[PDB]
Write a protein that binds this ligand. Structure first.
Ligand SMILES: CCCC[C@H](NC(=O)CCC(=O)O)P(=O)(O)Oc1ccccc1
Ligand SMILES: [Zn+2]
Ligand SMILES: [Zn+2]
Ligand SMILES: [Zn+2]
Lengths: 205, 211
């Protein structure tokens, strides 16, 4: 059971977008697909659902005309179209499979802005147990994902929520390894910015 | 249908109890559910049809109510229960509550501070950022005083705390001071000072440029 949601998106005010929610692993027409609006800060908000097969669509009154739900049985994929975009529509959008394990999609960060994409500049942060870091500075839009040594270091990692200052985002990430392992062994942070299709690695020397 | 959740956020002891309320706008006839949302993970259903616990969910999670008035409780709090919790009526369509972001208390823990110079790659640009991590501390409250040549620098700072550690109940915090490459080079001493409840005098970390 898979609910592969489409890629992160940046779109101007007034325009439209289409998010997909590709189901796989079970029979598509056995369940409904709900779309939820996620935060920032707090709160999940139900937008509506669609029936594959049936075609029955239910909406939240707030989202009628705002959101348009579709499904394509031939490709097992639910869609949501969002229209006349304002910055209040900047949020993470989650699709879910109706639960009567409970499966949700991974999320799709939609950003509504006149700004352009800037990939982040990743800076290495070098000095019993040592702490290293990476500064992921000045990017747009969200998200960014940081790993250390391709997912091999984890428990000593603390990645920080991005903060928007002067129309750009900056987040940092720290890893704390034993002094015994760095610099003898390599520590590299891997930073992905999906909206600019960059994957950047920086060895901390 | 509107659903009103309270509290918006809460802080409860380890091994203690918590009660979250939801108030429906109409009778929703016990068709309410409660979800646990951990950062970057599953909204996980815990309780459906007011009181029916979903499988494997401990006895210490409970749900009550009828009509319009509903409650949910968790007693004997464990660190693993750090999450934002939501109610959800599914009587007529679906409506979430506003959420309750839960924190679980812990023994006060002093932060591990780490100052880092600007990278030589950043100095290729006209900017130079000094970063400071104050890792795994409890009592979220903390002052990060920056000092450049013994003098406090307030403007040009970026702070961000992590969400509470699900395993050990501490927070982490990152403060970044950015300057121009030339303003950075006019000075020597860079200090990241930390005011926390666990010490009566700041946990300070520095570096000197012309050293
Ligand atoms: C809470 C328990 C009921 C879940 C719903 N399941 C049913 O209503 C099935 C029939 C039942 O036995 O009542 P669903 O997952 O569709 O709602 C949503 C919709 C959006 C987000 C989360 C859940
Ligand atoms: Zn099924
Ligand atoms: Zn219907
Ligand atoms: Zn100066």
């Amino acid at each position: 059971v898979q609910l592969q949601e489409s890629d992160a998106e940046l779109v101007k005010p007034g325009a439209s977008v289409k998010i997909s929610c590709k189901a796989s692993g079970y029979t598509f027409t056995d369940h409904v697909i709900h779309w939820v609006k996620q935060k920032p800060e707090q709160g999940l908000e139900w937008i509506g659902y669609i029936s594959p097969g049936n075609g029955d669509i239910k909406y939240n009154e707030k989202f009628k005309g705002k959101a348009t739900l579709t499904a394509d049985k031939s490709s097992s994929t639910a869609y949501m179209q969002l229209n006349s975009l304002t910055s209040e529509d900047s949020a993470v959008y989650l699709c879910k499979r109706g639960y009567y394990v409970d499966y949700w999609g991974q999320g799709t960060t939609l950003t509504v802005s006149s700004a352009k994409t800037t990939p982040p500049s990743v800076y290495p942060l070098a000095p019993s147990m040592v702490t290293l870091g990476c500064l992921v500075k000045g990017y747009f839009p969200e998200p960014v994902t940081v790993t250390w040594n391709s997912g091999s270091l984890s428990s000593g990692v603390h990645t920080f929520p991005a903060v928007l200052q002067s129309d750009l985002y900056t987040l940092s990430s720290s890893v704390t390894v034993p002094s015994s392992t760095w610099p003898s062994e390599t520590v590299t942070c891997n930073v992905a910015h999906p909206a600019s299709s960059t994957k950047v690695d920086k060895k901390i020397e | 249908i509107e659903l009103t959740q309270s509290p918006s956020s809460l802080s409860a002891s380890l091994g203690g109890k918590v009660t979250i309320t939801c108030k429906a706008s109409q009778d929703i006839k016990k068709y309410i559910g409660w979800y646990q949302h951990k950062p970057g993970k599953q909204p996980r259903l815990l309780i459906h049809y007011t009181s029916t616990l979903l499988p494997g969910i401990p006895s210490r999670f409970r749900g009550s109510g009828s009509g319009r008035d509903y409650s949910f409780s968790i007693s004997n709090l464990e660190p693993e229960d750090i999450a934002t919790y939501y109610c959800l009526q599914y009587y007529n369509l679906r409506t979430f509550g506003g959420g309750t972001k839960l924190e679980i208390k812990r023994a006060d823990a002093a932060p591990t501070v780490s100052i880092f110079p600007p990278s030589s790659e950043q100095l290729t640009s006209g900017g130079a950022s000094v970063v400071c991590f104050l890792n795994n501390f409890y009592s979220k409250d903390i002052n990060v005083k920056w000092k450049i040549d013994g003098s406090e620098r307030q403007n040009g700072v970026l702070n961000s705390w992590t969400d509470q550690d699900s395993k050990d109940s501490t927070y982490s915090m990152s403060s970044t001071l950015t300057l121009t490459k030339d303003e950075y080079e006019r000075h020597n001493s860079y200090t990241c000072e930390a005011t926390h409840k666990t010490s009566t005098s700041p946990i300070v970390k520095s570096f000197n440029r012309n050293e």
